[PDB]
Amino acid sequence: ALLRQAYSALFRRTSTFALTVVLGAVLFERAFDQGADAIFEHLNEGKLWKHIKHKYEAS
Amino acid sequence: GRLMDRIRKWYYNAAGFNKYGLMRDDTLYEDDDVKEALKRLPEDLYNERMFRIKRALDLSLKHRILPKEQWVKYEEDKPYLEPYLKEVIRERLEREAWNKK
Amino acid sequence: TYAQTLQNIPETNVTTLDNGLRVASEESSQPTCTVGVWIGAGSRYENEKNNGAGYFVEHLAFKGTKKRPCAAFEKEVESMGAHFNGYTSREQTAFYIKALSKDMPKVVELLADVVQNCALEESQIEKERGVILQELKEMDNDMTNVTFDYLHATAFQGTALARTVEGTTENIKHLTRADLASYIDTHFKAPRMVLAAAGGISHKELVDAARQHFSGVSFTYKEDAVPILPRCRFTGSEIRARDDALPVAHVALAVEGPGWADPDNVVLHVANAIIGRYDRTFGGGKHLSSRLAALAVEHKLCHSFQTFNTSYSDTGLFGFHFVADPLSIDDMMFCAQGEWMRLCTSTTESEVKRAKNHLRSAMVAQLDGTTPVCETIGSHLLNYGRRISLEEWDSRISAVDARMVRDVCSKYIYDKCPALAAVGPIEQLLDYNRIRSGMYWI
Amino acid sequence: APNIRKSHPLLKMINNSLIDLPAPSNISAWWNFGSLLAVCLMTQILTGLLLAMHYTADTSLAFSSVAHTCRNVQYGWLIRNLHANGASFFFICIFLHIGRGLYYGSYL
Amino acid sequence: CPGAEDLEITKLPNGLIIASLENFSPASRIGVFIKAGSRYETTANLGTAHLLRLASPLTTKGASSFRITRGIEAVGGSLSVYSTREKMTYCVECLRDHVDTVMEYLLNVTTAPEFRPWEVTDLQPQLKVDKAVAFQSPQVGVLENLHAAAYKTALANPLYCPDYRIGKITSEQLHHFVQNNFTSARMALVGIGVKHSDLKQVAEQFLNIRSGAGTSSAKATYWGGEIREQNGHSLVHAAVVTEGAAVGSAEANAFSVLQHVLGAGPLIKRGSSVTSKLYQGVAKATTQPFDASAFNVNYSDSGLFGFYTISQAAHAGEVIRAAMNQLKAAAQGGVTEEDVTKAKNQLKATYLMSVETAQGLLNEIGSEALLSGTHTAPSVVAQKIDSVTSADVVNAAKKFVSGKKSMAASGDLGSTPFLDEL
Amino acid sequence: YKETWNTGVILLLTLMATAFVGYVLPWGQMSFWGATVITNLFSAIPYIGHTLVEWAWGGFSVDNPTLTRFFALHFLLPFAIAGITIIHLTFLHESGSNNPLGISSDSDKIPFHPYYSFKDILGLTLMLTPFLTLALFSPNLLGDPENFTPANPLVTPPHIKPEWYFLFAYAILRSIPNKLGGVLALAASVLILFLIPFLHKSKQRTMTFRPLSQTLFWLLVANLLILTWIGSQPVEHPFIIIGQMASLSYFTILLILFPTIGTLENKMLNY
Amino acid sequence: VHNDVTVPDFSAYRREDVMDATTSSQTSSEDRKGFSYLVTATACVATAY
Ligand code: HEM
Ligand code: HEM
Ligand SMILES: C[C@@]1(c2ccc(Oc3ccccc3)cc2)OC(=O)N(Nc2ccccc2)C1=O
Known part of the structure; x- marks a missing residue:
């Protein structure tokens, strides 16, 4: 009954619906960025400065 | 003693709306209460008010005032709207008080 | 005092003639009285083939029985100064008589004879067939009723409550003497009927004549079985019948209601009391307590409007109806919906205090005479299976508060999909989606 | 008037052009380019201002100020791409808007 | 308690x-x-x-x-x-x-x-x-x-x-x-x-x-005029009356009873009115939908008595005339002694029912408590009503057929007769 | 006419921003330092202050990115002014103009044309003479000679003085010897205009028949002159005290005397 | 006459849970709305992002 539970607690009152969108965005962003960055770096393993750096890092 | 009376008479004269032939009541800003009160005025009192006002605006555009002999006199100013206006406000407050539970 | 008067009201007596019938009555000291039988039957019990039967029957229930043909039947009733009326609805039918308490017994006999031995004169049937067809054309001009029919037609589309009480043109043109007969035998049955009476009558003397004319007892358990009807599905939707040639427009909007037995109905009736009703002849005018009524007057939003909480066994229609000029529909609907929102969201203690008093005097008014009181009895046993005193109602009404009105109203109204019926010059009434949005926030 | 959406002198205007505005029930996708053109306009102006804030109109500095924008300004390159391509998007939409007009005789 | x-x-x-x-x-x-x-x-x-x-x-x-x-x-x-x-x-x-x-x-x-x-x-x-x-x-x-x-x-x-x-x-x-x-x-x-x-x-x-009696009203003077409103409606409403009895006038009950004897409204839903001389008579005359009733009003210094009809335009003539004969026929002893007995019941009944509702009870009390600061027992009123001979009724009926009549009708009066053709 | 008034204040504010960013463009000494003083006003806002200023600057001080963004703003804002003017006149037409007697003129209205079109064109040429006379015979009467010297980041002019139309406000800013306090006084000195409609106690709309308010009115006008003059002088006795006086009375007339006297006048009329 | 009017059959369009005429439609209302609003709330999140 998630759809049902979600409706009552989150989607019914316009106020709660707004808070749900705010937190939802906050959560979504954190996850979407990380996943997106991961997918990108994975498709480019060994080509980024992130990958090469260790060779010349010598601080 | 007659201080207040003295002051009021001075002010009336200082104000000067009487130089245009206007009664004190002719000069009230038409907010809601006044608008309502005006609608309750008898035909003649209403038509008279209108002439005094149109006449004053004509004086105002001409940059003239009335001849000193036609200026309304402090003690002859007729408070024609005040009674109506007071009832109107009295009624409004009653509704207001009543609608507050 | 008030309370005391509620407690001192004579109690309603009930008894069951093991054949399945219930006899109830409220005793007073009135030389005049009303008695009749309230049957749990109606269009909802009909189907596609016999729609309009119970109505067709309602027309013959007074044209004579077997024991006494037409003229004889009428003369006897007329000559005693008694009044014979009755009606047929969607879940309830009734046949009652107003007469001198001194004739309570002869009347009971007459009632029994009507419900049991209707002549169903083959020739009368063809005669009433034409009368009914004329009454359908008369009612087709009654917008208010055309509108409530349409409200049911869509609110309960696909089900039984979607059908009208009067029935179809095809049914009325082809209903058979056998069909009406079948209808009567199938539905007018002891366990599903209530002998109600009010006025100056002896409960025992009533029940006695009852035993004498309502005798046929049942053997099996199924003969003491009152069939539970199949559910009628509610559907948020709309039916738009447009005719710009009509002078005014009628609009009815409603949500599904709980159904008789549900206690929430006391709250919905209080709520409806807040919004109230109105028509262009309410001297009160712009000072009316009903906000919607006030706005209507101020903005000339409508010719009239009314709220309603129509109940049934397992469902109901909670809504409102208004009549407005083609150019003020939108603002009216706007304010009407606006008030429903206020109900769920910002109801006041003052608002309910008033609505409660209004409701009390309204219930007391539905008990003004022997016929209206009798109707309460019939309906009460038939719907609650027991009479509910004015003292009980008052007890329940007294418990209602602003918070309660909000929760209950939020429960049946807030963010719901309504049923809409619009008839006449309705071009200004905005689409369903727009109306649907008027169901939340405010 | 009972509801602000209609009485207020400013909302009245929004209501009569984007809320209660009567629209044909059957207009197709070809009627979408009007609003798209409006958005290009708002989009172009917004990105143009942002670019103008780093641009320098002088033959000796024009080319490099644009280079400076794309190379040094945070998301400068992005804003420039959006502006340059937005101009194309603007023409694509204006041509389709025109086509729709000729085809459906909107020019009447 | x-x-x-x-x-x-x-x-x-x-x-x-x-x-x-x-x-x-x-x-x-x-x-x-x-x-x-x-x-x-x-x-x-x-x-x-x-x-x-x-x-x-x-x-x-x-x-x-x-x-x-x-x-x-x-x-x-x-x-x-x-x-x-x-x-x-x-x-x-x-x-x-x-x-x-x-x-x-x-x-x-x-x-x-x-x-x-x-x-x-x-x-x-x-x-x-x-x-x-x-x-x-x-x-x-x-x-x-x-x-x-x-x-x-x-x-x-x-x-x-x-x-x-x-x-x-x-x-x-x-x-x-x-x-x-x-x-x-x-x-x-x-x-x-x-x-x-x-x-x-x-x-x-x-x-x-x-206090005071304030301005007193002028006495009611009978005219016996005739007003016809040609408005084209498919149905024609018509009323023919004669000066009837005044309030409290002994001759009141007579008309009340004659009213119920002729036909004073339906008692059976969609049912025919057999106990209605007037209705039954009109019914015999026309085939189409109609309605006929005994009209009766009692005022302080006067009253009106007659019949009110409603019929299709084309059959208004016959319907109105039929209603008239029922009045003559009644003026000529055509009133059973049992007819007067039945009507007396409907009258006693009606009155008794009228007081079931708060609006009716209050109106009954006040009405009388105003025109005589008293209150007649529901038994004295009944006692006064049935104590009305068959003669009285027939007389009331005669007073109508002989008295000067006034009439009013509206609708498509093309077939509605004038008072001087009745 | 609250909406006409409020948009009117937005118009003032926008005109101010416009004049400011515009004045900075020639990039003389006064353009530069005025741009420095004004922008640094925002740094007085607690917490976000420093952050906003450096953001607005596009760097660590008024510099080229400030200049190029200021040009763009200066180019844009005038059009916002034009647009909001339409809103101004739109709200205004809901009621039409008020008039000197403050009483309804519905009994005596006249078509805008040709009465006011002609009157307006006349007013145009009357004000156009001084404008052209100034511009053609005294081009530099109003500007600071300091702006004929290319901006120098390292040398601040001895007497930094704003354009005449900002003097009275500047005067107020300096009255409060506390950075943030002075900024608030400055902000309030203009935003006080949004409060005027709520400080109206008179039963009469105009001041035409209110002699006490008229005095109070000219006092305020003269108070503004004093501030203007004070804003052009150096922060030193007696200016400093005179300044704080004028500042204090400016707010006192608007927040206390006007509504108070308005009420007092109502009573002298026997209302 | 209006008595001869009936709402057509919308089975070719009804959501699964309100296909049966003898079943309360209220029991599946919250789910039917919860889902549709979920789409909307999600679109709002993607948009805010
Ligand atoms: C109708 C909307 C507009 C269109 C069609 C448009 C189109 C263009 C085009 C064709 C270019 C060249 C892009 C390139 O470098 O290849 C350009 C450049 C530019 N536009 Fe616009 N523009 C629009 C609005 C604006 C606005 C409102 C401004 C500024 C307030 C503006 C400022 C600029 C600037 C500064 C450049 C130079 C930087 C650059 O070349 O990227 N534009 N614009
Ligand atoms: C770019 C600035 C402005 C422009 C172009 C402008 C233009 C106008 C115009 C054309 C009128 C009508 C004629 C008149 O009465 O003068 C008007 C009236 C008015 N404006 Fe402005 N205005 C501006 C700024 C302001 C400001 C700063 C205020 C107030 C803080 C204001 C308040 C009003 C009001 C209240 C009226 C009503 C006049 C009356 O009493 O009838 N305006 N304005
Ligand atoms: C023309 C002028 C100006 C115009 C409008 C103003 O009003 C404001 C605008 C935006 C923010 C705050 C005030 C302020 C200054 O712009 C400008 O640089 N100056 N010069 C200046 C000199 C010393 C201190 C402060 C400013 C102005 O007078």
Whole structure:
């Protein structure tokens, strides 16, 4: 009954619906960025400065 | 003693709306209460008010005032709207008080 | 005092003639009285083939029985100064008589004879067939009723409550003497009927004549079985019948209601009391307590409007109806919906205090005479299976508060999909989606 | 008037052009380019201002100020791409808007 | 724990009559009965009584228009005003525990009206509306014309403000009407669900518009005219009458019984009326839908008696004539002794049922408590009714066939006969 | 006419921003330092202050990115002014103009054309003379000679003085010897205009028949002159005290005397 | 006459849970709305992002 539970607690009152969108965005962003960055770096393993750096890092 | 009376008479004269032939009541800003009160005025009192006002605006555009002999006199100013206006406000407050539970 | 008067009201007596019938009555000291039988039957019990039967029957229930043909039947009733009326609805039918308490017994006999031995004169049937067809054309001009029919037609589309009480043109043109007969035998049955009476009558003397004319007892358990009807599905939707040639427009909007037995109905009736009703002849005018009524007057939003909480066994229609000029529909609907929102969201203690008093005097008014009181009895046993005193109602009404009105109203109204019926010059009434949005926030 | 959406002198205007505005029930996708053109306009102006804030109109500095924008300004390159391509998007939409007009005789 | 009760009925020195009755009902219904109405209007102030009826919600010296409406609604109460050509009733209903509250308003409205010029100006256009809805029933239109044909004065005055006067009635006219008619000797404070001592107290300590008989109405002069409104409706409504009996006139019961003997309304839903001489007769004459009834009105100094029909336009002729023969045929002894017995039941019954509802009971009490500060026992009234010979009835019937008749009809009168062809 | 008034204040504010960013473009000494003083006003806002200023600057001080963004703003804002003018006149037409007697003129209205079109064109040429006379015979009467010297980041002019139309406000800013306090006084000195409609106690609309208010009115005008003059002088006795006086009375007349006197006048009329 | 009017059959369009005429439609209302609003709330999140 998630759809049902979600409706009552989150989607019914316009106020709660707004808070749900705010937190939802906050959560979504954190996850979407990380996943997106991961997918990108994975498709480019060994080509980024992130990958090469260790060779010349010598601080 | 007659201080207040003295002051009021001075002010009336200082104000000067009487130089245009206007009664004190002719000069009230038409907010809601006044608008309502005006609608309750008898035909003649209403038509008279209108002439005094149109006449004053004509004086105002001409940059003239009335001849000193036609200026309304402090003690002859007729408070024609005040009674109506007071009832109107009295009624409004009653509704207001009543609608507050 | 008030309370005391509620407690001192004579109690309603009930008894069951093991054949399945219930006899109830409220005793007073009135030389005049009303008695009749309230049957749990109606269009909802009909189907596609016999729609309009119970109505067709309602027309013959007074044209004579077997024991006494037409003229004889009428003369006897007329000559005693008694009044014979009755009606047929969607879940309830009734046949009652107003007469001198001194004739309570002869009347009971007459009632029994009507419900049991209707002549169903083959020739009368063809005669009433034409009368009914004329009454359908008369009612087709009654917008208010055309509108409530349409409200049911869509609110309960696909089900039984979607059908009208009067029935179809095809049914009325082809209903058979056998069909009406079948209808009567199938539905007018002891366990599903209530002998109600009010006025100056002896409960025992009533029940006695009852035993004498309502005798046929049942053997099996199924003969003491009152069939539970199949559910009628509610559907948020709309039916738009447009005719710009009509002078005014009628609009009815409603949500599904709980159904008789549900206690929430006391709250919905209080709520409806807040919004109230109105028509262009309410001297009160712009000072009316009903906000919607006030706005209507101020903005000339409508010719009239009314709220309603129509109940049934397992469902109901909670809504409102208004009549407005083609150019003020939108603002009216706007304010009407606006008030429903206020109900769920910002109801006041003052608002309910008033609505409660209004409701009390309204219930007391539905008990003004022997016929209206009798109707309460019939309906009460038939719907609650027991009479509910004015003292009980008052007890329940007294418990209602602003918070309660909000929760209950939020429960049946807030963010719901309504049923809409619009008839006449309705071009200004905005689409369903727009109306649907008027169901939340405010 | 009972509801602000209609009485207020400013909302009245929004209501009569984007809320209660009567629209044909059957207009197709070809009627979408009007609003798209409006958005290009708002989009172009917004990105143009942002670019103008780093641009320098002088033959000796024009080319490099644009280079400076794309190379040094945070998301400068992005804003420039959006502006340059937005101009194309603007023409694509204006041509389709025109086509729709000729085809459906909107020019009447 | 309450039981039975007496129907008291004081009568203060100034002439004000006070009739109360405790029935322990949870709802009280007080009212101010008065001998006023369009009857007392003259050409100059026609319609003034109609507007006065609608002016009940206007501000008074004690309560403002606003508080009158809000106040009464605050306690689920109601306020209404009913009136005939010769009497006006202002009643309020509410739950017992609020009688005190609601009373202040009933009082103010009937004795302390202010008829403020502006409030009055604003209200007058309502006369158009009120009247437009009333006239949707053809019934109302013909009865208006009827009294206009029946009389030359007083009762001839219409119950609804004539059109040429909507907007012309003045506050002065409303005031003078109230002053010259709402006098203590023409009024009666009747109540139900209350205790005499209480109601009695309210009257004396509050009612101030004082004594006198105020302006008396002119006597009702019979005209016997004929008004025909050609408006094209498919149905033709027609009424033919003759000066009938006055209120309290011994000859009243005779007509009442003759009324029920001829046909005084249906008793069976969709059912035919066999006990109706008049209906049964018309039925034999026409094949189409129709309706016929014995008409009967009793006023203070006069009354009207006859029949009212409703028929398709083409069959109006026969339907009206058929109704006439039923009256002659009755005037010529064509009245059974059993007919008079049955009618007497329907009459006793009707009367008895009429008092089932609070509105009916109160009206019965006050009506009589006004025209004679007394109260006839429901047994004396019955005793008086059945004690009406078969002769009496036949006589009433004769008085009709011989008396000068007045008629009023509206609709597509192309086939409707003129009074001199009946 | 609250909406006409409020948009009127938005118009003032926008005109101010416009004049400011515009004045900075020629990039003389006064353009630069005025741009420095004004922008640094925002740094007085607590917490976000420093952050906003450096953001607005596009760097660590008024510099080229400030200049190029200021040009763009200066180019844009005038059009916002034009647009909001339409809103101004739109709200205004809901009621039409008020008039000197403050009483309804519905009994005596006249078509805008040709009465006011002609009157307006006349007013145009009357004000156009001084404008052209100034511009053609005294081009530099109003400007600071300091702006004929290319901006120098390292040398601040001895007497930094704003354009005449900002003097009175500047005067107020300096009255409060506390950075943030002075900024608030400055902000309030203009935003006080949003409060005027709520400080109206008179039963009469104009001041035409209110002699006491008229005095109070000219006092305020003269108070503004004093501030203007004070804003052009150096922060030193007696200016400093005179300045704080004028500042204090400016707010006192608007927040206390006007509504107070308005009420007092109502009573002298026997209302 | 209006008595001869009936709402057509919308089975080719009805959501699965309100396909049966003898079943309360209220029991599946919250789910039917919860889902549709979920789409909307999600679109709002993607948009805010
Ligand atoms: C109708 C909307 C507009 C269109 C069609 C448009 C189109 C263009 C085009 C064709 C270019 C060249 C892109 C390139 O470098 O290849 C350009 C450059 C530019 N536009 Fe616009 N523009 C629009 C609005 C604006 C606005 C409103 C401004 C500024 C307030 C503006 C400022 C600029 C600037 C500064 C450049 C130079 C930087 C650059 O070349 O990227 N534009 N614009
Ligand atoms: C770019 C600035 C402005 C422009 C172009 C402008 C233009 C106008 C115009 C054309 C009128 C009508 C004629 C008149 O009465 O003068 C008007 C009236 C008015 N404006 Fe402005 N205005 C501006 C700024 C302001 C400001 C700063 C205020 C107030 C802080 C204001 C308040 C008003 C008001 C209240 C009126 C009503 C006049 C009356 O009493 O009838 N305006 N304005
Ligand atoms: C023309 C002028 C100006 C114009 C409008 C102003 O009003 C404001 C605008 C935006 C923010 C705050 C005030 C302020 C200054 O711009 C400008 O640089 N100056 N010069 C200046 C000199 C010393 C201190 C402060 C400013 C202005 O006078």
